[PDB]
Design a protein around this ligand. Structure first.
Ligand code: CLA
Ligand code: CLA
Ligand code: CLA
Ligand code: CLA
Ligand code: CLA
Ligand code: CLA
Ligand code: CLA
Ligand code: CLA
Ligand SMILES: CCCCCCCCCCCCCCCC(=O)OC[C@H](COP(=O)(O)OC[C@@H](O)CO)OC(=O)CCCCCCCCCCCCCCC
Ligand SMILES: CC1=C(C/C=C(\C)CCC[C@H](C)CCC[C@H](C)CCCC(C)C)C(=O)c2ccccc2C1=O
Ligand code: SF4
Ligand code: SF4
Ligand code: SF4
Lengths: 160, 739, 130, 80, 61, 171, 41
C-alpha cells in the first residue's frame, strides 16, 4: 500500500516472528516444573506476546519486509492513531505544563521575594495554577489577543 | 554538667529545614542566580566554613559518621532481606557448583521480565556477583529465616545509629578534649573494635561456622543440620566433628594449646571440597589477630601512668637530614580533620586494593573461587574503591595544606622541609614518570610496529628479546618452598598462585600457579608508570597548594578556585583541586589498566576447566602470553574478542548489560562537552535563551547562569568516571557471566 | 651561617631565584620588624624574621609583593621593594612616592585614563592598517 | 607588555589597586566622582595580565580594562 | 528624576540595558555619573546597583 | 648536626647544600671529569668526551640493532659502527649550531673585566653580560670543543669496535 | 508542623514527589494497557 508496505495481518514474516518468539518462550518454559511461579511468569509472557501481536495485526498497521509495524506519519487521517492523535495528546499535555509554569512564574514574580518562591514553592498557589491549565489553548488565545503574552522592548539586548 | 559532653547544644527543630543554605554565611541570604543552587550542595559538608570552632566541626563530623553508619546498616539489612525473600539461596546451598546466585527478581513491566535469568534452582532473577551467598555459607547461615533475622537486626542497628547521631548532636555533644584524646581513641579502636571484633568473630566461627560448614562439606543437607544454638548447648554435636571440645576450656587455661589443633590449624592452600580457605585456618587467624590487636591496644597513655605519649614519640624522631623531625606533627593531626582524612583515606584505599588482591589470590569463602563473576566483580570493585579513596586522601592532604597548615607551628619540621625542596621531588618524579612511560609504553609500541612490519623476532616477547621478571619468579619460588623450610608448621603454600597443584572444584579451576613471563613484566611496569604519574599529579597538587613561582600567594585563593587569570601566559587549573581532578583522570586510567590486566590474565592463564585426565583448558586459551604484548593485541584479542558477549546480549537475559554498555558510552561522551568547552560560550547561549524567555514573559526570577568553571570541571570528571567505569562494568559482567 | 646578618633566619629552599636573577634582574624587599616573628616564604617554607633590619631577595616583583602583603598581617608597613639589574642598579619600586598606591597622594598624574566609558571605544574596522 | 586602561566610570573605590599583585595600579587625584580619586596604570611594564584588577571592579561594565599584548619575562611571570 | 523614580537604562554596555531600575540618589555635585540606580536582577559580578549619567537614564511614565 | 644547609650561605638561591650537591666525593668526581678537569684545552675536553661517548654508543647499536647476530658477524659490527658514527655526526651538528647561536666571544675571562672597568656603553650582550667565564663559553672554544667531540667520537667508536671484535673472537 | 510542611514545599522534595507520582501513573498505565504502539482509538 502506502510506500510499498503491506498490512501486518497479511505479512507472513510477522507471523514468523510471532511463532519464533512463542517457540523460544515455550522452550524456556520446558525447563521449569509444574505450576511453579517461573512457569506462571513464562505463560503470562506467552499470553502477552500473543495479545500484542494480535492487536498489532488488527490495528491498520503497515509492515515492511522485516515484519515490523511501520508508522505512516505523512499526515493522512487513515493512519491517524500512529502519530496525529498522540501528537495532539502531547501538545495538550506539554502546553498544560508550560502554561502552568509560566503562570506560576508571572504570579510569584509580583511578590516581595520572587526568588524565594522558586526554591520553596507556594504549594497552595501552585495547585491553584496547575489545575487551571486545562484551558491553556483558550487562555493562550485570550492573552495573545490582549497583548499580555509577548514583551516588546523592555527585553535586554547585547551591545551589537 | 559532664566534663566530656555538652547537654542540649542544638534544639531539635524543623525551622532550619525550611531555610536552605542556613549553614553558610553567603548562601543564607537566599538565591539570586542558579549558581546558589549548586553552591548549596557543594558546601553542605564543608563544615570548616560553616563554623569557626573546631568543636562544632568535630561534633558535626561525629553525627555525620553516625548517619553514614546508619546508611550502611540499612544497605546491609536490604541485602539480607533480599537474600531472605527474593533469592534462591536455599537452592544454591544444595547445589553450589551448578546454581548461579541470584537475589533480585525483576517486576514484569514494559517487557523487562527478560532480565529474570535462568539462574537455576527453579528460580528466575538477576545473577548476583557480590558473593553474598558464599559469605552467608561461610557464616554458617543455612536457612532464609536467619537471613530475615539478620535483616531485622540490620534495620534495628540502622535506627540505633540514626538515634545515636541525633543524640550526639542535639542532646549530648562531646567536647573538643574528648575528640582530641587520640591516645584513648587509638587504644580503643585497636583493642576493643579490632581485637574484640576479631575475637568475637573467632568465637562465632569456632562455635557456629566451623561445625555447620564441616557438616555441609560432608554432604549433610541444610535441613538435617542442627540449628546453630544447639552447637553451643550441646558439647557433643561439635565434639564429633572436632574431637577436642571434649576437654573443654581446660587446655586453654592450662596453656596446653596443642590440644586445640583439631579446629585451630595452620594448613594453607585451599579446601579441596569448596575451593576456599580452611575455616579452621580462618578461625585460628582471627584468634591470633584478636590477641595481637588487643596487645597493640595497650600502647598509648590515656588515663594512668602507663603507656606512650604520641607527642613524645614523634618529637624524639629527629635526624641529621630532617632537622626538627616529627616535631609538631602531633599538633597537626590533633587540630586538623583534613590531615587525618588524608592519611586515613590513603591507607584505606591502599588497604582496599590489598584486600582485592588477597581475595582472589586466596579465596576465603566456600565455592567462591569457581564463581568467576563474583571473583572478577569483587576484585574490580575493591580496586576501584581503593583508587577513589587514595585520590581522596591526596585531595584532603591538599585541603589541609591550603587551610589548616600553620607555617609558624611547623618551623623546620618534616612538612616544612618537604615544601622547601618540593622542586627536587617533583622534578625527579617527572623524570621517573617519563622514564617509566617511555619504557613500558614504547616497548609496547615497538612490539606493535615490529609485528606490523613482519619482524616477529624483534619483539619484546618470550620467543624474542625476553624480559623475564626474575625477581618476582624468585619470590614465587620462595613461597612454594616455604612449607617445611621457612614455614615448617605449614602443610601447603599460602596461595597456589605462587606455585603448586591445580585446584579444581567440580571440574572448574579454583586456583592455579600464575606464571609470570615477559607479558607480565610489561604490564607490571605499565602499572608502576601509571601509579607514578598519578602520584606526580597529586603530590604536585599537595606541595604547590600554598605557593609557587607562578602564584606566590596561591594559598590566599583557597583550595578550590578555577585560575588566577589569563596572565602569566595563562594560569588555568593551578589550584590544588584541579590536581585532584587530573589525578582522578589518571587514577581512572591506572585502575582500568589494572583491572584489564587482571581480567585477561585470569581468563587466559588461571580460570577454565580441568579434564578428568588432568588437561587444563582455559577460558581464552593462553593468548595472554603472546598477544598482550602489543596494543593491537589488547584491542583485538581482549577488547574486541571479549566484547562479543556484550554486543550479542540483546534479546537475552544479559540485555541490560548491553543497554548499560551503550548508556555508559553515551555518558562518557557526554562528559567531553563539559571537559572540552568553556563557561563563556554557555553563558552567552543562555543569554539568547533568556532573551526568548523574556520575550515570552517566562524568564525565571532566579537568573540562570552557566555552571562555574570548577563545577564544569567537576561535572566533566564525574561523567567521565561514571561512563568509563560503567562501560567496563557492563563489559566485565556480561563477558564473565556468559562464559 | 648566612652571608648577611640582616637576612631572615631561613634555611634555604630550592624555590628561590635562578640564573635569571643573576643576568636579567633581581628584586630585594627590606623591612624592619619589632619581633622575630615566624613567617612563610613566598618561595618555600617558614623563615624567622630578625628583631630589626630584614632583607630578602627574590626573582619576581610579585614574590616580593606577596611577602609584603603577608607582612601587613604582622602590622609591618615600612616594607620597601627594589629592583636590581645585573649590576648594582637599585630602583625603588613599591612605595614609589613613599605612599602606598591604595592611598591618594598629590603629585600623581593619571596614566591610561580614557574620558569615556567602554561603549565609546572606536570600532575595530576603523583601526585597520595603522 | 599588556595594556591597562582606566575609564571615567571609575568611582574611586580602590578595590582594583589593592588587588593588583604586581603594583601596577595606583590611586590618583580626580574630580569626576564623589571620592575625588581615580585609578591609574603607570607601571604596566609589571602588568602580568591576571585580571584580578577587574575582578574587583564594582562598576557596571568595568572601569579598568586589561588588554593582553606582547609578552615579556615580567608579564609571563617567569621566575627563571 | 529623583530618589525613588523609575528609569530605563540607555547605556548599551550595561547588564541592565533596556531594563527598568529604581533611582537611589541623584548627586547634585559636578560628578560625571550622578544617578545611582538599584536593580532587582544582579549582574554577572553579583552587584545590583550602578552609577549612571543623566543622558543614560530615561524616566518611565 | 645538620647535613643540609643553604648553598654558600645564601638562603634565597634555588639550591641547597645537600650531601650530594656539595660532598667531597661529588667535588672530586666532577673535577676529574673532562668537562671540569683542570688543565684541559677545549679541544682536549671535546676529544675525551667524544671518545667515551662513541665508545659506549657503539654498544647498543651493535647489540640490539636491526642486523644483530647471536654469534659474531662483521656485518653487525659494521652496522653498529656506522650507526654510532652517524649519531656522533648528528650530535656534532647539534653542537655546532648551538655554539653558533649561543656565544659571540673569542677570548673570555677578559671582556667581562674590560666592560666592568672601561665601561660597556654599547649594544650589550657581547661586551656586557656574558654568562660564564670558561674557555668553553666562546665561539672559538665551542668550535674546537665540537671538533674534538667529533674526532674523538670517531676514534672511540673504532676502538670499541676493535675491542668488541677481539672479545667475540678470542674469548 | 508549620516548618515541616514548608520543608516539604522545597524544590527537591516537591520535584521528587511529582516525578515519583508521574513515573507511577505512567508505569501503571503501561501495566494495565501494555504494548501500546498506537493510539487506542
Ligand atoms: C516550565 C516553564 C517553562 C516554559 C514555559 C518554557 C518555555 C520555553 N523554553 Mg524553557 N526551560 C525551562 C522551563 C520552561 N521553558 C526550564 C526549567 C529549563 C531548564 C532545563 C529550560 C531550558 C530551556 C532551554 C535550554 C531552551 C528553552 C527554550 C524554550 C522555548 C521553546 C520551548 C522549548 O524548547 O522548551 C524547552 C524545554 C525544556 C528544555 C525542558 C523544560 C524542563 C521542564 C519540563 C520545565 C520545568 C517545569 C516546571 C518545574 C513546572 C513548575 C511549575 C509549577 C510550580 C506550577 C520556550 C519559550 C528554548 C528556546 O529558547 O527556544 C526559543 C531553549 O533553547 N528552555
Ligand atoms: C537500601 C538498600 C535497598 C535497595 C537498593 C532496595 C531495592 C529494591 N527493593 Mg528493597 N528493601 C530494603 C532495602 C533495599 N531495597 C530493606 C531494608 C527492606 C526491608 C524493609 C526491603 C524490602 C523490600 C520488599 C518487601 C520489596 C523490595 C523491593 C525492591 C525492588 C523494587 C523497589 C521499588 O520499586 O520500590 C519503589 C519504592 C517507592 C516508589 C517508594 C518511594 C528494588 C530492587 C520489591 C521487589 O523486589 O519486588 C519484587 C519488594 O517487593 N524491598
Ligand atoms: C527529625 C529529627 C531531626 C530534626 C528535626 C533535626 C533538626 C536539625 N538538625 Mg539534625 N540530625 C538528626 C535528626 C534531626 N535533626 C539526626 C538523626 C542526625 C544524625 C545523622 C542529625 C545530625 C545533624 C548535624 C550534624 C547537624 C544537624 C543540624 C540540624 C539543624 C538544621 C538541619 C538542616 O537544615 O538540615 C536538614 C537536612 C536534611 C533534611 C538532609 C538529610 C540528610 C540525610 C541524612 C541524607 C540521607 C540520604 C540517603 C543517604 C540517600 C542519598 C541518595 C536542625 C535544628 C545542623 C545544625 O544544627 O547546625 C547548624 C548540623 O550541623 N543535625
Ligand atoms: C571499645 C570501645 C570502642 C569501640 C568498639 C568503638 C567503635 C567505633 N568507633 Mg569509637 N571511640 C571510643 C571507643 C570505641 N569506639 C572512645 C573511647 C572514643 C573517645 C576517644 C571514641 C571516639 C570515636 C570517634 C570520634 C569516632 C569513633 C568511631 C567509631 C566507629 C568506627 C567506624 C567503624 O569501624 O565501623 C564499625 C562499625 C561497627 C562494628 C558497628 C557496631 C558498633 C557499635 C555502634 C558499637 C559501638 C561501641 C560504643 C562505643 C559503645 C557505647 C554505647 C553507649 C550506650 C555508651 C566504630 C563503631 C567513628 C564513627 O564512625 O563514628 C560513629 C568516629 O568518628 N569513635
Ligand atoms: C571518607 C571520605 C570522604 C569525606 C568525608 C569527604 C569530605 C569532604 N570532601 Mg572529599 N573526596 C573523597 C572522599 C571524601 N570526602 C574522595 C574519595 C575524593 C576523590 C574523588 C574526594 C574529592 C574531593 C574534592 C575534589 C573536594 C572534596 C571536598 C570535600 C568537603 C566538602 C564535601 C561536600 O560538600 O560535598 C557534598 C557532596 C556532594 C557535592 C555530592 C556530589 C555527588 C557526587 C560527586 C556524584 C556521586 C555519583 C554517585 C556515585 C551515583 C552515580 C550513579 C548514577 C547512575 C546516577 C568535605 C570535607 C571539597 C572541599 O572543598 O573540601 C574542603 C572539594 O573541593 N573532596
Ligand atoms: C594516549 C594519550 C596520552 C598519552 C600518550 C599521554 C602521555 C603522557 N602523559 Mg598524559 N593525559 C592524557 C592522555 C595521554 N597522556 C589525558 C587524556 C589527560 C587528561 C586528564 C592527561 C593528563 C596528564 C597529566 C596531568 C600528566 C600527564 C603526563 C603524561 C606523561 C607521562 C610521562 C611519560 O610517559 O612520557 C613519555 C611519553 C610517552 C609514553 C608517550 C609516547 C612516547 C613514545 C612511546 C616514545 C618516544 C617516541 C619517539 C620520541 C618518537 C620520535 C619520532 C617522532 C619525532 C616522529 C606522558 C607524556 C604527566 C607529565 O607531565 O609527565 C611526567 C602529567 O603530569 N598526562
Ligand atoms: C503514584 C502513582 C500511582 C498511581 C496513580 C497508582 C495507581 C494504582 N495502583 Mg499503584 N503503586 C504505585 C504508584 C501508583 N499506583 C507505587 C509507587 C507502588 C509501589 C511500587 C504501587 C504498588 C501497587 C500495588 C501493589 C497495587 C497497586 C494498585 C493500583 C491500582 C488500584 C489502587 C491503581 C491503578 C493495585 C492494583 O490495581 O492491583 C490489582 C495493587 O494491588 N499499586
Ligand atoms: C522521546 C521519544 C519517545 C517516544 C515518542 C516514545 C513512545 C512510546 N514508547 Mg518509549 N522510550 C523512550 C522514548 C520514547 N518513547 C526512551 C528514551 C526509552 C528508554 C527508557 C523508552 C522505553 C520504552 C519502553 C520500555 C516501552 C516504551 C513504550 C512506548 C509506547 C507506549 C507509550 C505509552 O506508555 O503510552 C501510554 C501512556 C500514556 C499515553 C501517558 C499519557 C496518559 C495521560 C495520563 C492522559 C491524561 C490526559 C487525558 C510509545 C509508542 C512501550 C510500548 O508499548 O512500546 C510500543 C514500552 O514497553 N518505550
Ligand atoms: C631512602 C633514603 C632514606 O630514607 O634515608 C633516610 C634519611 C635519613 O634522614 P634522618 O636521619 O634525618 O631521619 C631521622 C628522622 O627524621 C626519622 O624520620 O632520610 C633522608 O635523608 C631523606 C632523603 C630522601 C632521598 C630520596 C632518595
Ligand atoms: C553544557 C554546559 C554548561 C551548561 C549546563 C547547565 C546550565 C546545566 C543544566 C542542568 C539542568 C538545569 C539540571 C539537570 C537536568 C538533568 C536532566 C538532571 C540529571 C540527570 C539525573 C538522572 C541525575 C556549563 O555551564 C558549562 C560550564 C563550564 C564548562 C562546560 C559547560 C557545559 O558544557
Ligand atoms: S577562564 Fe579558563 S582560561 Fe581564562 S583564566 Fe580562568 S581558567 Fe584560565
Ligand atoms: S593584571 Fe590586572 S591585576 Fe594583574 S597587574 Fe595588571 S592590572 Fe594589576
Ligand atoms: S576598579 Fe573600577 S571602580 Fe574599583 S577602583 Fe579601579 S576603577 Fe574605581
Amino acid at each position: 500500500d502506502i510506500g510499498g508496505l503491506n498490512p501486518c495481518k497479511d505479512s507472513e514474516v510477522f507471523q514468523k516472528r510471532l511463532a519464533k518468539t512463542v517457540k523460544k518462550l515455550e522452550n524456556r518454559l520446558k525447563k521449569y516444573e509444574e505450576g511453579t511461579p517461573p512457569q506462571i511468569a513464562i505463560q503470562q509472557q506467552i499470553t502477552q506476546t500473543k495479545q500484542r501481536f494480535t492487536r498489532y495485526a488488527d490495528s491498520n498497521l503497515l509492515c515492511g519486509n522485516d515484519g515490523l509495524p511501520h508508522l505512516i506519519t505523512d499526515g493522512r487521517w487513515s493512519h491517524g492513531s500512529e502519530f496525529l492523535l498522540p501528537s495532539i495528546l502531547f501538545l495538550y499535555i506539554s502546553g498544560w505544563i508550560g502554561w502552568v509554569g509560566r503562570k506560576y512564574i508571572r504570579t510569584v514574580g509580583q511578590t516581595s521575594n520572587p526568588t524565594e518562591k522558586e526554591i520553596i514553592i507556594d504549594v497552595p498557589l501552585a495547585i491553584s495554577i496547575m489545575t487551571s491549565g486545562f484551558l491553556w489553548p483558550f487562555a493562550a488565545w485570550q492573552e495573545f489577543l490582549s497583548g499580555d503574552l509577548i514583551a516588546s522592548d523592555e527585553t535586554i539586548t547585547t551591545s551589537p | 554538667k559532664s566534663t566530656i559532653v555538652d547537654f542540649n547544644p542544638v534544639e531539635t527543630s524543623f525551622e532550619k529545614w525550611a531555610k536552605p543554605g542556613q549553614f553558610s554565611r553567603t548562601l543564607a541570604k537566599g538565591p539570586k542566580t542558579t549558581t546558589w543552587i549548586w553552591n548549596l550542595h557543594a558546601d553542605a559538608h564543608d563544615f570548616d566554613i560553616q563554623t569557626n570552632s573546631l568543636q562544632e566541626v568535630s561534633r558535626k563530623i561525629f553525627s555525620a559518621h553516625f548517619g553514614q553508619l546508619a546508611v550502611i546498616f540499612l544497605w546491609l539489612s536490604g541485602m539480607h532481606f533480599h537474600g531472605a525473600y527474593f533469592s534462591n539461596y536455599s537452592a544454591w546451598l544444595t547445589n553450589p557448583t551448578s546454581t548461579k546466585p541470584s537475589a533480585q527478581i525483576v517486576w514484569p513491566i514494559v517487557g523487562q521480565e527478560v532480565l529474570n535469568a535462568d539462574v537455576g534452582g527453579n528460580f528466575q532473577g538477576i545473577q548476583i556477583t557480590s558473593g553474598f551467598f558464599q559469605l552467608w555459607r561461610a557464616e554458617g547461615i543455612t536457612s532464609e529465616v536467619e537471613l530475615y533475622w539478620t535483616a531485622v537486626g540490620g534495620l534495628v542497628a540502622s535506627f540505633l545509629m540514626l538515634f545515636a547521631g541525633w543524640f550526639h548532636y542535639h542532646k549530648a555533644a562531646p567536647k573538643l578534649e574528648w575528640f582530641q584524646n587520640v591516645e584513648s581513641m587509638l587504644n580503643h579502636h585497636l583493642a576493643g573494635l579490632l581485637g574484640l571484633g576479631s575475637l568475637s568473630w573467632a568465637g562465632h566461627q569456632i562455635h557456629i561456622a566451623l561445625p555447620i560448614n564441616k557438616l555441609l562439606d560432608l554432604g549433610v543437607s541444610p535441613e538435617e543440620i542442627p540449628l546453630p544454638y544447639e552447637f553451643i548447648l550441646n558439647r557433643d554435636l561439635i565434639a564429633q566433628l572436632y574431637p577436642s571440645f571434649n576437654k573443654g576450656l581446660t587446655p586453654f587455661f592450662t596453656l596446653n594449646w596443642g590440644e586445640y589443633s583439631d579446629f585451630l590449624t595452620f594448613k594453607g592452600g585451599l579446601n579441596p571440597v569448596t575451593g576456599g580457605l580452611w575455616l579452621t585456618d580462618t578461625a585460628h587467624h582471627h584468634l591470633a589477630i584478636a590477641v595481637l590487636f588487643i596487645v597493640a591496644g595497650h600502647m598509648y597513655k590515656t588515663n594512668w601512668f602507663l603507656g606512650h605519649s604520641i607527642k613524645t614519640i614523634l618529637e624524639a624522631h629527629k635526624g641529621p637530614f630532617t632537622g626538627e623531625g616529627h616535631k609538631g606533627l602531633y599538633e597537626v593531626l590533633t587540630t586538623s580533620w583534613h590531615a587525618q582524612l588524608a592519611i586515613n583515606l590513603a591507607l584505606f584505599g591502599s588497604l582496599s586494593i590489598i584486600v582485592a588482591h588477597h581475595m582472589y589470590a586466596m579465596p576465603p569463602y566456600p565455592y567462591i573461587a569457581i564463581d568467576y563473576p563474583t571473583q572478577l566483580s569483587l576484585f574490580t570493585h575493591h580496586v576501584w574503591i581503593g583508587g577513589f579513596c587514595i585520590v581522596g586522601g591526596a585531595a584532603h592532604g591538599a585541603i589541609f595544606f591550603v587551610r589548616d597548615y600553620n607555617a609558624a607551628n611547623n618551623y623546620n619540621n618534616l612538612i616544612d622541609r618537604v615544601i622547601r625542596h618540593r622542586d627536587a621531588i617533583i622534578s625527579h618524579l617527572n623524570w621517573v614518570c617519563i622514564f617509566l612511560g617511555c619504557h613500558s609504553f614504547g616497548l609496547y609500541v615497538h612490539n606493535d610496529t615490529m609485528r606490523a612490519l613482519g619482524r616477529s623476532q624483534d619483539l619484546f616477547s618470550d620467543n624474542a628479546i625476553a624480559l623475564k621478571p626474575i625477581f618476582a619468579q624468585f619470590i614465587q619460588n620462595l613461597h612454594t618452598l616455604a612449607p617445611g623450610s621457612t614455614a615448617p608448621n605449614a602443610l601447603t603454600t599460602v596461595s597456589y598462585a605462587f606455585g603448586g597443584d591445580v585446584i579444581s572444584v567440580g571440574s572448574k579451576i579454583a586456583m592455579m600457579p600464575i606464571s609470570l613471563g615477559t607479558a607480565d613484566f610489561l604490564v607490571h611496569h605499565i602499572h608502576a608508570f601509571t601509579i607514578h604519574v598519578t602520584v606526580l599529579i597529586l603530590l604536585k597538587g599537595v606541595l604547590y597548594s600554598r605557593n609557587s613561582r607562578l602564584i606566590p600567594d596561591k594559598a590566599n585563593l583557597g583550595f578550590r578556585f578555577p585560575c588566577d587569570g589569563p596572565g602569566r601566559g595563562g594560569t588555568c587549573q593551578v589550584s590544588a583541586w584541579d590536581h585532584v581532578f587530573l589525578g582522578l583522570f589518571w587514577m581512572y586510567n591506572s585502575i582500568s589498566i589494572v583491572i584489564f590486566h587482571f581480567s585477561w590474565k585470569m581468563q587466559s592463564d588461571v580460570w577454565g576447566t580441568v579434564s578428568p585426565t588432568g588437561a587444563v583448558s582455559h577460558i581464552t586459551g593462553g593468548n595472554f602470553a603472546q598477544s598482550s604484548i602489543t596494543i593491537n593485541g589488547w584491542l583485538r584479542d581482549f577488547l574486541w574478542s571479549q566484547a562479543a558477549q556484550v554486543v550479542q546480549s540483546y534479546g537475552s537475559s544479559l540485555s541490560a548489560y548491553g543497554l548499560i554498555f551503550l548508556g555508559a558510552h553515551f555518558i562518557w561522551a557526554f562528559s567531553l562537552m563539559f571537559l572540552f568547552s568553556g563557561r563563556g560560550y554557555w553563558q552567552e547561549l543562555i543569554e539568547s535563551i533568556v532573551w526568548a524567555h523574556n520575550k515570552l514573559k517566562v524568564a525565571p526570577s532566579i537568573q540562570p547562569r552557566a555552571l562555574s568553571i570548577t563545577q564544569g570541571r567537576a561535572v566533566g570528571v564525574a561523567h567521565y568516571l561514571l561512563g568509563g567505569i560503567g562501560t567496563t562494568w557492563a563489559f566485565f559482567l556480561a563477558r564473565i557471566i556468559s562464559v | 651561617k648566612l652571608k648577611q646578618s640582616d637576612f631572615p633566619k631561613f634555611e634555604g629552599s630550592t624555590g628561590g631565584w635562578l640564573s635569571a636573577a643573576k643576568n636579567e634582574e633581581k628584586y630585594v624587599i627590606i623591612w624592619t620588624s619589632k619581633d622575630a616573628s615566624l613567617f612563610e616564604m613566598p618561595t618555600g617554607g617558614t623563615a624567622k624574621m630578625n628583631a630589626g633590619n630584614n632583607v630578602a631577595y627574590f626573582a619576581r616583583k610579585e614574590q616580593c609583593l606577596a611577602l609584603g602583603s603577608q607582612l601587613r598581617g604582622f602590622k609591618i608597613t615600612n616594607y620597601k621593594i627594589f629592583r636590581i639589574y645585573p649590576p648594582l642598579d637599585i630602583t625603588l619600586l613599591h612605595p614609589f612616592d613613599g605612599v602606598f598606591p591604595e592611598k591618594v597622594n598629590q603629585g600623581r598624574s593619571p596614566v591610561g585614563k580614557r574620558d569615556a566609558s567602554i561603549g565609546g571605544n572606536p570600532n575595530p574596522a576603523s583601526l585597520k592598517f595603522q | 607588555s599588556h595594556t591597562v586602561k582606566i575609564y571615567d566610570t571609575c568611582i574611586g573605590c580602590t578595590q582594583c589597586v589593592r588587588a593588583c599583585p604586581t603594583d601596577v595600579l595606583e590611586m590618583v587625584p580626580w574630580d569626576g566622582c564623589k571620592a575625588g580619586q581615580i585609578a591609574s596604570a603607570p607601571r604596566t611594564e609589571d602588568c602580568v595580565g591576571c585580571k584580578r584588577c577587574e575582578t574587583a571592579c564594582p562598576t557596571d561594565f568595568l572601569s579598568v580594562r586589561v588588554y593582553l599584548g606582547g609578552e615579556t619575562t615580567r608579564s609571563l611571570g617567569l621566575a627563571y | 528624576i529623583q530618589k525613588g523614580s523609575t528609569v530605563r537604562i540607555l547605556r548599551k554596555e550595561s547588564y541592565w540595558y533596556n531594563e527598568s531600575g529604581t533611582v537611589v540618589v541623584v548627586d547634585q555635585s559636578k560628578v560625571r555619573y550622578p544617578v545611582l540606580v538599584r536593580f532587582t536582577k544582579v549582574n554577572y559580578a553579583g552587584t545590583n546597583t550602578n552609577n549612571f549619567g543623566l543622558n543614560e537614564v530615561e524616566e518611565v511614565v | 648536626v645538620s647535613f643540609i644547609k643553604p648553598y654558600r650561605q645564601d638562603p634565597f638561591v634555588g639550591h641547597l647544600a645537600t650531601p650530594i650537591t656539595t660532598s667531597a666525593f661529588t667535588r672530586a668526581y666532577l673535577k676529574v671529569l673532562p668537562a671540569y678537569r683542570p688543565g684541559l684545552t677545549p679541544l682536549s675536553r671535546g676529544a675525551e668526551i667524544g671518545f667515551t661517548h662513541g665508545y659506549f654508543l657503539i654498544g647498543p647499536f651493535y647489540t640490539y640493532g636491526p642486523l644483530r647476530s647471536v654469534e659474531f658477524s662483521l656485518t653487525s659490527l659494521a652496522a653498529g659502527l656506522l650507526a654510532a658514527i652517524t649519531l656522533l655526526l648528528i650530535l656534532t651538528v647539534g653542537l655546532s649550531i648551538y655554539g653558533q647561536v649561543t656565544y659571540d666571544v673569542y677570548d673570555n675571562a677578559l671582556i667581562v673585566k674590560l666592560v666592568r672597568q672601561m665601561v660597556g656603553s654599547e649594544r650589550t650582550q657581547d661586551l656586557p653580560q656574558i654568562k660564564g667565564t670558561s674557555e668553553l663559553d666562546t665561539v672559538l672554544g665551542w668550535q674546537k670543543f665540537s671538533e674534538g667531540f667529533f674526532s674523538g667520537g670517531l676514534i672511540g667508536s673504532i676502538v670499541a669496535a676493535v675491542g668488541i671484535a677481539l672479545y667475540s673472537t678470542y674469548l | 508542623m508549620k516548618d515541616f510542611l514548608k520543608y516539604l514545599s522545597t524544590a527537591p522534595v516537591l520535584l521528587t514527589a511529582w516525578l515519583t507520582f508521574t513515573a507511577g501513573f505512567v508505569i501503571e498505565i503501561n501495566r494495565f494497557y501494555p504494548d501500546a504502539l498506537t493510539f487506542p482509538f
